[PDB]
Design a protein around this nucleic acid. Structure first.
Lengths: 399, 221
RNA sequence: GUGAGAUUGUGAAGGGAUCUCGCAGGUAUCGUGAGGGAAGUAUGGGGUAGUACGAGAGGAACUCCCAUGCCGUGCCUCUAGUUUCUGGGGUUUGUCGAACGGCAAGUGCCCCGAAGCCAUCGCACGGUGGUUCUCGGCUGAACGCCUCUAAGCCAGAAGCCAAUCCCAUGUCCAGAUGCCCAC
RNA sequence: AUCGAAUCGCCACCUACAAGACUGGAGCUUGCUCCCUCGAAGGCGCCAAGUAUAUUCAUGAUCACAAGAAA
RNA sequence: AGCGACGUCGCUUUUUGAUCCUUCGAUGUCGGCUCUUCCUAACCUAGCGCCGCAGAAGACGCUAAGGGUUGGAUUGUUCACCCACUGACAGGGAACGUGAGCUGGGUUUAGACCGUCGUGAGACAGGUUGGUUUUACCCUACUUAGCUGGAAAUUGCGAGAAAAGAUUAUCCGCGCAAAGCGGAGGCAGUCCGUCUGGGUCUGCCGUUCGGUGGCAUGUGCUUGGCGCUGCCAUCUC
RNA sequence: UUAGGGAUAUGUGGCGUCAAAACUUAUGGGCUCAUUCUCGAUACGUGAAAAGGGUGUUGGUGGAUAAAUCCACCGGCCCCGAAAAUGGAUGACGCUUAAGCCCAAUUAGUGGUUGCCCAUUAUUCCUUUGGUAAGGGCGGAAACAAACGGAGAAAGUGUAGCCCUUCCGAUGUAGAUGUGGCCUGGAGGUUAGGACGAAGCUUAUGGCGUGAGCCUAAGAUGGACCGGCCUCUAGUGCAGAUCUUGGUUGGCGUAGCAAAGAUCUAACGGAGAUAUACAACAUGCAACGUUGGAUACUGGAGCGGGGAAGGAUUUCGUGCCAACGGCACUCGU
RNA sequence: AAGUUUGAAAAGCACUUUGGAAAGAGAGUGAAAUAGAACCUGAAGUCGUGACAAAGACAAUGGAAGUACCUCCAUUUCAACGGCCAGAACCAGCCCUACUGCAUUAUCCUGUCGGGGGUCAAAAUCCGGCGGGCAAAAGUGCAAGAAUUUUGGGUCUUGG
């Protein structure tokens, strides 16, 4: 007999299985459609999550109560040192699926990259890529590099670039990984020979974020959520916890099925995982693409604040530390905890709208400590509210 | 490589010569689906190795909106409690055919899976089979025979396009691609074929004359 | 063939024969994606407009813009909840002679409390093509006219299929590559 | 290297395409006449590299997996 | 349009009967809560036909089950009624879904009271208050979590490429290709047998690699540091 | 309509694949197009459909006006009428020049006259067994050594059947009976075996019987009894009773051993270690007692000191660790 | 509940050796120690261990019928030889296939003349009259035609 009162089911059956992701890497499962008019460009970039702050900006959206007014929007900072491009790869198109054709390796790879192939590197003989670096040259090795490029030109549909992160140039000793995270990046636009022209010029050269993305563009992110380990049905799905009096415990689901089918359906909520599942968010709009402190300090200064400052809060990002390299600053939450690699990819969803086409102008960026309640924006603002202090009255006696 | 290193090492240790088994390759353009599959199913139980080719162009009787619905009624049937174990639904026409065959084979016995495993279908005509021998045809499965031309029919590849078989364009571009490469090569040979075709009538002249009267008898002259 | 090992019921040591097994992969990365899952849905306000319509009384809607309800996937900058950090302070009884330091009351109790976790109690984001039904038509006979149909065609629903999204080669990928072996 | 194997048609002329209310070419009279290559043939292989004067074959002892293996 | 009497033909199994086929060495027997799914005879949501459709509101019908379908007072209630919101507060199935999921208000015991009936013990499908809700560690299902073989689905040696274009020779790049074109280290000693050829070793000199010593530029970039290219030279290869 | 087998032929049902037969037969005639429970297609099996409708198509009957046409009515197939709850069913795939419906045929106006497949059926052949069974032979015809054509022949219900030829039947619950019919403990007889290995036991030990069963082989099993045959005799044949008793077993190294707060360190004891084929951790782990020290509990209604009921050597000292104190003991009631 | 029944006799394992001990490895007694204390025989069931057979998920077993590899159990054969395996001839029986005659035709055959019909004109389909007759063959009804009567096949479905 029917259920007394209807209510929407809990959870989204399309994210099944709830399954701990095969990779922490968060690769893009697709890339945007080729326009094949626009000049070739790289469609995505690897990025490390640092933390969150809020900002103050003033909206321009005719028709709203917020119309010309200031609004405080939380924002996530993601540092993004230059990626290096080690390889070119291209894809023949067959009546079943794409298929790779070959791959053309750059003539020099760092130890960051071939750090991948071993699982214990320093005690290895460290021979990765030893033989091609030897065979990539002389004669029989100039030819074979040339015929696989010619294979791409004739037989390839899609052409991608193998690019890895630089974990030296990012000096963060809480991330711990000295293996270089590797992904493929698709080159969209131009004819197939125009893609090979670009990709062949990228090899061995770094790629900064600002070449891939623009400040006020939106970018959708591919990342792996924070793993909670096995969780009950009430945290895993919505399940409206049962009344107090119940025997054998109240956080369970009560009826997991009818007599018939005599089985438990795949749609009934159970316990497990509630995992580090992979996810691709949409339309996360870039507020700021910064630049490294070494090059251009005054990262968090504006045409409004005008106080020499940086995006790293007082006392660093908790559990992360100072953001040394150039970073994207991005409105809203991004899935995954601090430290995790993520990929920003050129947005797939069609972007025509007031919200998603706008020029972002930030009034303020909050550098106050994220430990406790930070009431000071800079270390100078703090030394003004205190001044001379017992440990300071001492250190001058060292003089 | 697909072969193990040993059966490459064995074949090289015993040398001999490369081998290919005697294989049939049936074109399939405008062969009736359920008639061509039966004939194939009975030749797989007799121990024949069959390569079906151009499955996209198989036909079915009746309107296209009708046979779409027949396949959509086939999508409606899945295992409700755990569909990953529910009946599977193949889209690509080469798969529609190996099912129409398969359900006509005793597939639950080791000879039913031994027969099926000897069939290979394809979309188009893949290079793996373009030039090996001459394509064969099943004259009781043909459309210009089996269907009254007045009746509407379907092309299996167009029906399966509007279910989830999205490779249709990729195939149409590979058929446009080969049929040129073949007919460029075909007309290229017209210089040679006419040489031989001339050298038979030119040989019939200076060939010994008591034999040519035999060829005129038994008819090859 | 070559390497290894066995032949264990009633002693030891020989030799012979025979049987079984190994004899080429291993390890590391980037990907394809068949099949299966599948998701966003609904309202209000601005405006159109006191307009269409109507004797009047009355009184709509689309493009567009802005919000919200329900659901979904996240997140912790803010605000809120939580504190076994027994963190700092207070405080009652007992207790080490007093003080200091504490300690016992299964965390004595009280106020504040970071990190973490977390709330429609906070914050972010949630979209594209096609085939069709109903129906309205075009051309047009059967049937000298007529007719949306008999042949052909157009337009076309929150339905159905694919894109996006989730797991993915027992879908045994002769997809690509790193390195050592074997041939 | 075990291994002794069941299989017994080769091809750089088939291994291009299309149509079947139609495909050799044509004329009015539109179902007949006329023209051509005559509209019913992938080639080759089947024991002298070629149809003619030749030339080892046994005793593997009447059948036996063909005791044969690069057309 | 919308209805439609007197008649008449069916469908459904969400009513109650009728029967008594299965279960009495036992299928836990009302209702709510929770949770999922299915059906369409469609309440709202999408598209449309028609009207006694001017507009507004609505009637009737068609495709359509993707989505949605509430907060409470009283009642053990299912049912029912009223309050309030809403775009709407549609009808149902799944052993009248759902008790090793719960709850135990009702029914259905032992105590007890009343009414009616009986001489009486006691009865009542009447009223009342109180009255134990047991077990999963097995198999499957399901939810997550690992290990691992395998195409003759473990064997056969039983050979099939969504490959490429040719005989031991293409040696390679290009070309749909035809046509046609640009580019190919050499010398002196060895073994072995098919146009001289093959198979290696060795001596000799070269180009493209390789790795040692000096000088700038591009890139990045520290915890004034980490690393790579670049020209020349030498060395090794 | 069923004894155990072979052949040929068939019945009901069939010949597109599953699946044997038209490798999709004919040189047979018509009719049918059916868009989400998807046209139709095994009688019995409403195991699904009606009334009513249709200028869908294909036939027919009646009347009428004259280049053919019009009106009424009646069929065939097909369509609308036709809405249920897990995904699902002509049996599945699928079929449309049917692999659908009606009718018809047998290699097709070419000669008349059996296309093909499948039964525990029919016909026939072989083998068995039983008859209300039928018949024959049974007075030894004669001859006949090894060495370098043989052997039986019983006057008989039943046997390894006295022999032979013939004919018919042969399945079966409850039940009835038959057997010269199998097994078991014993008693009367008879004939044998056994330390050169009895009963018992074990075996990919074979042989015989339709079967109960028998018998031989082997034991690198055993250590003293025992077989056949006639007759007698009975506590005489096991898989099942929520059968009885003993044992074992999967579940399973699983549930679990979670009230009463709690132990720590050093030295000494002890087999219980500091246990190793080019340094120490990475290769002897955990656990025990006593003494000293630390910390903590009981908190005088006490894990304090004494008695009754009840127990009766648990008391005490030395030794001791097999079992016992559901973990451990070097300790102990 | 429980044979305490080791063996003929305790000859009830001295001694060496590893162990804290229990015990283990040796040795010794005895015909047997796999008669070592519960000790004769030592079953079923379940478990371990070496070897080996393989094996997909159809729960497993089961029927029938082969084959693969073992077995070494049985019987048989080993030379003017066979009870084994193959072919080929002939004989009886059985089965199958090929080979054909007797009747029958008339609502017919074929002339011709009248119609009648059509066509440019004819013929034909069609009705009637009058002649003649055999469509020489018909999908008429019955069929007996000796298959070594110097030549049909099969019998691994029978026996020689």
């Amino acid at each position: 007999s029917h259920c007394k009162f209807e209510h929407p089911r809990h959870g989204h059956l399309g994210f099944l299985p709830r399954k701990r992701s095969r990779q922490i890497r968060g690769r893009a499962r697709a890339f945007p459609k080729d326009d094949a008019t626009q000049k070739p460009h790289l469609t995505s970039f690897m990025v490390f999550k640092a933390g969150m702050t809020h900002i103050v900006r003033d909206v321009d959206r005719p028709g709203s109560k917020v119309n010309k007014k200031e609004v405080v929007e939380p924002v996530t900072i993601l540092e993004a040192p230059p990626m290096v491009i080690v390889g070119i790869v291209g894809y023949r198109q067959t009546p079943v699926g794409l298929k790779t054709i070959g791959t053309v390796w750059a003539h020099h790879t760092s130890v960051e990259f071939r750090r991948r192939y071993y699982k214990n590197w320093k005690q290895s003989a460290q021979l990765a890529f030893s033989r091609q670096k030897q065979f990539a040259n002389t004669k029989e090795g100039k030819v074979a590099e040339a015929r696989t490029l010619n294979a791409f030109a004739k037989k390839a549909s899609v052409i991608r670039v193998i690019a890895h992160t630089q974990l030296r140039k990012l000096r963060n000793h809480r991330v711990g990984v000295k293996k270089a995270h590797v992904q493929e990046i698709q080159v969209n636009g131009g004819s197939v020979a125009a893609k090979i022209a670009l990709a062949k010029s990228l090899l061995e050269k770094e790629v900064r974020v600002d070449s891939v993305f623009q400040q006020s563009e939106a970018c959708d992110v591919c990342s792996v959520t924070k793993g909670h380990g096995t969780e009950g049905v009430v945290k895993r799905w919505g399940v409206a916890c049962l009344p107090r009096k119940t025997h054998r415990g109240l956080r369970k689901v009560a009826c997991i099925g009818a007599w018939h089918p005599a089985r438990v359906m795949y749609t009934v909520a159970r316990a497990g995982q509630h995992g580090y599942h992979h996810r691709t968010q949409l339309n996360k709009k870039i507020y700021q693409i910064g630049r490294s402190v070494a090059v251009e300090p005054n990262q968090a200064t504006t045409t409004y604040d005008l106080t020499a400052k940086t995006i790293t809060p007082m006392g660093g990002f908790v559990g992360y530390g100072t953001v040394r390299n150039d970073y994207v600053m991005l409105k809203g939450s991004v899935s995954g905890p601090r430290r995790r690699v993520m990929t920003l990819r050129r947005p797939m969803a069609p972007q025509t709208s007031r919200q998603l086409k706008e020029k972002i102008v930030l009034k303020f960026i909050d550098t106050s400590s994220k430990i406790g309640h930070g009431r000071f924006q800079t270390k100078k603002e703090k030394n003004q509210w205190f001044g001379p202090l017992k440990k300071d009255r001492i250190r001058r006696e060292e003089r | 490589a697909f072969p193990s290193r040993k059966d490459a090492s064995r074949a090289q240790r015993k040398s001999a010569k490369k081998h290919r088994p005697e294989i049939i390759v049936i074109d399939l353009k405008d062969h009736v689906l359920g008639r061509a599959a039966a004939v194939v199913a009975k030749q797989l139980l007799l121990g024949k190795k069959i390569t079906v080719v151009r499955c996209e162009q198989l036909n079915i009787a009746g309107t296209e909106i009708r046979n779409k619905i027949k396949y959509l009624q086939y999508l409606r049937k899945r295992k409700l409690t755990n569909p990953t174990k529910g009946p599977f639904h193949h889209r690509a026409p080469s798969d529609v055919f190996v099912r129409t065959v398969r359900s006509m084979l005793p597939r639950y016995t080791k000879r039913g899976m031994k027969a099926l495993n000897s069939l290979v279908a394809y979309e188009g005509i893949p290079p793996n089979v373009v030039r090996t021998g001459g394509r064969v045809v099943i004259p009781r499965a043909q459309r210009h025979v089996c269907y009254r031309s007045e009746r509407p029919y379907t092309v299996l590849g167009n029906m399966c396009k509007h279910v989830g078989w999205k490779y249709s364009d990729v195939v149409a571009n590979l058929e446009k691609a080969r049929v040129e490469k073949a007919s460029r090569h075909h007309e290229k040979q017209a210089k040679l074929r006419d040489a031989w075709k001339s050298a038979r009538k030119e040989a019939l002249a200076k060939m010994p004359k008591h034999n040519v009267e035999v060829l005129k008898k038994f008819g090859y002259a």
